[PDB]
Design a protein around this nucleic acid. Structure first.
Length: 58
DNA sequence: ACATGCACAGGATGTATATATCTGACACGTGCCTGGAGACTAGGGAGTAATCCCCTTGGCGGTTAAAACGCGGGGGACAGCGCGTACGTGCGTTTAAGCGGTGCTAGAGCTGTCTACGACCAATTGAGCGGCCTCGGCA
């Protein structure tokens, strides 16, 4: 068989706009820890997205 | 006589040999964008002289904290309970990993504008005349 066409993003499943997959990509390749949680980048993206929303509104 | 320092046992720690490969130092192509200098331009700045007004100064003077000092409460020092922390332990859930699939998010493009960037004009708020008036005043 083959992998899923138009498979839904971690971001849009969370309702976020920031790239949660890239947050996981960068947490892992950024060497911050040898293993990284699946909801860790959701939480981090949501905080960066919140700070981004607040600072841009002001 | 106390905190620091002595050698043994234990148990794992750093180690040496090994299989497998991808990280990274290198020559070369690459070809950018930086280093360079000059022509051109006039906005900005250098140096001097004017003089206002500010920080420094010496001071008067008060009143403040340091200074000397004692009362009594509470900080500093051991036994006694019990509650938390460090593991022991097996379970099982968590992410990692292979490398495809293929989505959209990327560099770089080109697009047409088209916000907002200069530059000009028409507002509202400032101290100095002008004539009036009264209060305060002299002879």
């Amino acid at each position: 068989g083959k992998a899923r066409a138009k498979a839904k993003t971690r971001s849009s499943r969370a309702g976020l706009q920031f790239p949660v997959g890239r947050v996981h990509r960068l947490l892992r390749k950024g060497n911050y820890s040898e293993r990284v949680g699946a909801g860790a980048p959701v939480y981090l993206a949501a905080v960066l997205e919140y700070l981004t929303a607040e600072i841009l509104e002001l």
